[model samples]
Target: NSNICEVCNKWGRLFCCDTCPRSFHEHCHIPSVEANKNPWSCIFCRIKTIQERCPESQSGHQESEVLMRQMLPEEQLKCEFLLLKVYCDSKSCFFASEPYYNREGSQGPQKPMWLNKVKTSLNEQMYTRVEGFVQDMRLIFHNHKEFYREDKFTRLGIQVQDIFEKNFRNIFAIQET
Candidate 1:
């Protein structure tokens, strides 16, 4: 673990990027400190990789207006579903009833915080952000294949793999033409 701060060449408690083998000081990291949790990459790396990896949008194309609009509606929902399902394997995945109960109470929507971030990105036409998020998730899914390779029938993790296999894989596998 070469965990030296990439900024100052100094040692400190650092956030190590799960994507690239880079460590960043909390203050030095491009992603806000809040994004440091769970899995994340340094912002520069994310933007660069997104630029390099994805097919750049067709400029002046009306389809390009909404970043994910080119994708099928069901495919779009499946992608979001697979991503959220992996994270919220427990009852937290539910809406309306599992949370604060009534919508009239003004408590909030039942979706979790990160899901809200994804929803906002999609709605706001942050295509690159969504792409980066999906890439990060794929990296995580592939790297942890050993955990999923089990034959145990009771595991929700295994079930998640099944869901991804059947629903999300083909959509994500193809290049967004």
Candidate 2:
């Protein structure tokens, strides 16, 4: 494949801009590409031109930008093992108080309900998706455990270790080790 710029047709030491995957000669822009360390943004005019010409590409570019912005640098770190702790109050403790109504011919008393029933309903509906996510995480942990056990030299072990370390540092550093 030729290394020429798809935009200016310039060739020689072709460099692709990280922002838009478009090739450009190092000399095409100021601050020569050799000195550029961070990800480079493609020329504004070229991006605008391409976006104007291609709606699908424009949408994809916008989506990619959104995803790139949402990506956390810590996500690159590895994780090895995980521990989870969950606590729930007993039903009696949760509903310790009685309900009263001041209306004639009204029901004597219904059970005392949690204050955040709407939030509970929303969380219940959301938990279905969360359960699927938990299943996926379990599968990933199982696979990672298998890989770490079977292949000590595999990059998978290192990657998983890094992830666990990162997550622990981010989430549990202040708590008990």
Candidate 3:
């Protein structure tokens, strides 16, 4: 409701979401805000639309690990939904897939992971199994935690990790009874 970007919590000119009471900076939003669009929706609303449009196929429940063991092709949309959720919840600041600004001892694997890298992997069909996708998602948090250990970004990283885990359960119907 207040005049601030939902993603960054910063004050400036913002594009408001028509479907929800959220506002975002043009540059902070995924795909960025367009200049000509009216009554535009946020990524969260768009994700809900995707879920609504693609009615879930009814099937017997499976174990969470079993669901994760399925191929990526079977769960790609859910994965993207999770990533988009992370993008939005991460304050729109942690999408960088490339190496971040200087961190002396953070380089372990030359290719450090981030949200965009996970997306690239999804786009390029690099993941064979659903767990592979989950692994990369976790890695984004792990890398950030290792590198920015005591910073706000680390806190955001952990928050997104929590978001990913909760949503993963919901999207996969990973119920624990």
TM-score per candidate, in order? 0.29, 0.22, 0.59
Best by lDDT: 3
List model 1 lDDT by residue over 1-177, tens digit each: 456866445788878877778776775442333453677755545544644666452122332233344444433443444454443334223211222323332343223233345444544545443344464344333423333345342254345445444434443343344
For lDDT, candidate 1 versus 2, the one ahead is: 1
How much does each candidate deviate from the true structure in C-alpha RMSD?
A: 17.2, 23.4, 5.3
Q: What tens digits encode model 3's per-residue C-alpha lDDT throughout 75-133? A: 66667666766665645355465765576655544447777677677768787778788
The alpha-carbon deviation from the true structure for residue 117 of candidate 2, after best TM-score superposition, in angstroms, is 70
Q: What is the lDDT of residue 24 in candidate 3?
A: 83
Candidate 2's residue-wise lDDT over 78-143, tens digit each? 110111100011221222223243444333322223213312332243323222323333343343
lDDT of 1 at 26: 70
Alpha carbon lDDT at 56, candidate 1: 52
